[PDB]
């Protein structure tokens, strides 16, 4: 039975590959030959948000586009007022080892998680004027890689146990569990309509899930190494990825195959984070080599470099407004680039 | 009033400096080791689903934060990025054990990891009394698993602890030599392995860790001051 089932699975793999290849008439490079290249994109460090003790591992912009939460391995969440560099909050964490942080779209909560296998929800707007833990979402058997708020009550989280889970914060129990990734899930990205989310794992494959149904819609396997970053294209029909193999790949949900790969021969180090600009034309990627490269999404060539970090650029994020880009680094400073 | 907001930010920065002092004054240690190794007993004997079990203990008025990784997947590639820039790694091995080759491969992976390249390893060879009993009894011999012990002879520098048979000293020094060889193969001077012959009940473990942290911090400062 095992051999027969494997043969059937390989036949299905071949069918999927053939269909994807047939759908490949042109490539995004050919279509984007016409469009004039973005040219030289230059952005300067408008702010430096210092005050963290240890490596900054994650950051997330608030929907208001001014406040941004930031996590460091010293057990500190700091909500910065990006405009004035003010520390709005400094939430001490019960677990020093934090690998992810999220900001609720309403701005009322920040989620947090890491090597404690727990995603802690913090209530920013209590009546006591002190940020307190609103919930602790236990149930993962590995570290929390990424977490994102669907709303004030729903949060979906990756894990190093190779599963993604959707939670109901009031109840504190997993509404549904997404299984199928063969390696540690390293990042999420919620679609702008929040009906779909895509997760990259250490098995070098990116999967698309349906939150309401709870099942993998389709799978993408372009990369040769583990995926460290993933972000949805603003249109919601494509998403970029970042892998240790030092290349981004842009997939389209409807073509169900890679559209383009962003890589250069000198670029020989892994990617830690990726995101698009407001229009989706620029694909900002952070790298292990202490700097961040700006790519022309439609084309395949660098449009600039956000050099200026003294250590690994661990996290990167673009305001929902699209006005500025915040990049955190293992040297413990966030920098806002505009 | 944004002036009051700036005052609040000032207060937060004051608290952050207060905590920065504690963070600087404390040393962080990553505890590793296979389940058969008595790392759990090592943390238990410290007299001061979940993924980490922090242990606080203090020696000569210096605080040590020892982190033991708990519920985590069998592959340690990714989460060991966090423990980059810790004071040291305490890799514990069962000397008696035979999964000693698994321990050797694990130690090789830890040593040659990209991010742990500047992290010294306080290599613990635990359960040495059990190794002594194993060798003396003759039920099992390391020659069955490793062929070089049929050729190895005790080096001169091997100081015999009183009451130790020559056979057990030779065995334990062969075990030590395995790990020292793995460490010296890639040791470029950025990180140093610190082998130790230890037992589960030994209260000397905290003192040994403190001494090796003293040496590691001494090397770090020496490199910082351009003396190495």
């Amino acid at each position: 039975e095992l051999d027969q089932l494997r043969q059937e699975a390989e036949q299905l793999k071949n069918q999927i590959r053939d269909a994807r290849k047939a759908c490949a008439d042109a490539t995004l490079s050919q279509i984007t030959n016409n469009i004039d290249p973005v040219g030289r994109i230059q952005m300067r460090t408008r702010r430096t948000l210092r005050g963290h003790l240890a490596k900054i591992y994650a950051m997330h912009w608030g929907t208001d586009s001014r406040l941004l939460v930031s996590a460091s391995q010293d057990g500190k969440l700091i909500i910065w007022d990006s405009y004035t560099t003010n520390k709005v909050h400094a939430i001490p964490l019960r677990s020093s080892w934090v690998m992810t942080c999220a900001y609720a779209p309403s701005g009322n909560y920040v989620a947090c998680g890491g090597l404690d296998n727990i995603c802690s929800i913090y209530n920013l707007k209590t009546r006591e004027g002190n940020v307190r833990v609103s919930r602790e979402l236990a149930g993962h058997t590995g570290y929390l890689s990424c977490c994102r708020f669907l709303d004030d009550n729903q949060i979906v989280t990756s894990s190093g146990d190779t599963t993604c889970a959707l939670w109901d914060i009031e109840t504190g129990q997993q509404t549904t569990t997404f299984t199928g990734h063969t390696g540690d899930v390293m990042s999420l990205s919620l679609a702008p309509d929040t009906r779909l989310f895509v997760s990259g794992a250490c098995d070098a494959s990116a999967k698309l899930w349906d939150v309401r149904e709870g099942m993998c819609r389709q799978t993408f396997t372009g990369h040769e190494s583990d995926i460290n970053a993933i972000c949805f294209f603003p249109n919601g029909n494509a998403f970029a990825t970042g892998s240790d193999d030092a290349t981004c790949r842009l997939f389209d949900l409807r073509a169900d195959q890679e559209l383009m790969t962003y890589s250069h021969d000198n670029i020989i180090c892994g990617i830690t984070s990726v995101s698009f600009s407001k229009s989706g034309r620029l694909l900002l990627a952070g790298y292990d080599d202490f700097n961040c490269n700006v790519w022309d999404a439609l084309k395949a060539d660098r449009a600039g470099v956000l050099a200026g970090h003294d250590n690994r650029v661990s996290c990167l994020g673009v305001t929902d407004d699209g006005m500025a880009v915040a990049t955190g680094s293992w040297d413990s400073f966030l920098k806002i680039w505009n | 009033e944004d002036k009051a907001a700036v005052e609040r930010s000032k207060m937060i920065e004051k608290q952050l400096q207060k905590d920065k002092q504690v963070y600087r004054r404390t040393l962080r240690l990553l505890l590793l080791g296979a389940d058969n190794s008595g790392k759990s007993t090592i943390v238990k004997q410290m007299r001061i689903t979940s993924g980490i079990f922090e242990t606080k203990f203090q020696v000569d008025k210096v605080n040590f934060h020892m982190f033991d990784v708990g519920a985590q997947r069998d592959e340690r590639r990714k989460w060991i990025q966090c423990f980059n820039d810790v004071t040291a790694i305490i890799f514990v091995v069962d000397s008696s054990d035979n999964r000693l080759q698994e321990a050797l491969n694990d130690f090789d992976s830890i040593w040659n990891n990209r991010w742990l390249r500047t992290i010294s390893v306080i290599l613990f060879l635990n359960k040495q009394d059990l190794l002594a009993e194993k060798v003396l009894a003759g039920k099992s011999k390391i020659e069955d698993y490793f062929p070089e012990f049929a050729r190895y002879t005790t080096p001169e520098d091997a100081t015999p602890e009183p009451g130790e048979d020559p056979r057990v000293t030779r065995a334990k020094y062969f075990i030590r030599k395995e790990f020292v060889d793995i460490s010296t193969a890639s040791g470029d001077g950025r990180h140093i392995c610190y082998p130790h012959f230890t037992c589960a009940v030994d209260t000397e473990n905290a003192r040994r860790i403190f001494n090796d942290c003293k040496d590691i911090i001494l090397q770090m400062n020496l490199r910082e001051y351009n003396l190495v």
């Epitope: 003010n86 709005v88 006591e128 | 009033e1």
Partner: single-chain antibody, 228 residues
Amino acid sequence: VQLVESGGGLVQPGGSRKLSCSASGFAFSSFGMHWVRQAPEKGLEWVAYISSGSGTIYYADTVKGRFTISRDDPKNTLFLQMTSLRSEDTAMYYCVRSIYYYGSSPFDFWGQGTTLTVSSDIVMTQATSSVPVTPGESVSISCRSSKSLLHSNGNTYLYWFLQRPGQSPQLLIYRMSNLASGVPDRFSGSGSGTAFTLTISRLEAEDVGVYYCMQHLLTFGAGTKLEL
């Protein structure tokens, strides 16, 4: 969240007193406290302020030097010592809680207060002293300011307070547009940067009371009463 004032009573004009307010149910340290006096048959008047961490302190010109504000975090108590008094100082002394950071709501909670008795400014003017009205109707309570309350940063620092008879004031609208937590959507805030309007849409039996405007660019308005 509970702030109960202490002291109060009869004092001769040359005498001295000390009002104490004990905070309960919130992190008293993080909040900057105010003292606001409510003289009989007259509107609110801001007395003094002490920021978080016993830092910046301000007093009104009338009581600058005469009064002194003090704060004790361990006891969660706010003090207001008056070395000298007058007949004017007779007033219900409220202790007001406020916190300042981006998006916060200053002056959200008001203590019950104690009635002490005794033997340039941005003047706020309210268009009407009293507004006879019927239940279920909308009312456009309006006020003006000496200078535009719209700061360079981009928000008008205007606050609206409702004082139900026999109650302490309650924050309705802060920064001219944002409803306070627990305030029903009946109320609405609007303004031009120099003139402002609190346009309640449907009156309720609990919405009848005296409405005070305040600026925070501290001065309160004369107060507009609602008569059902």
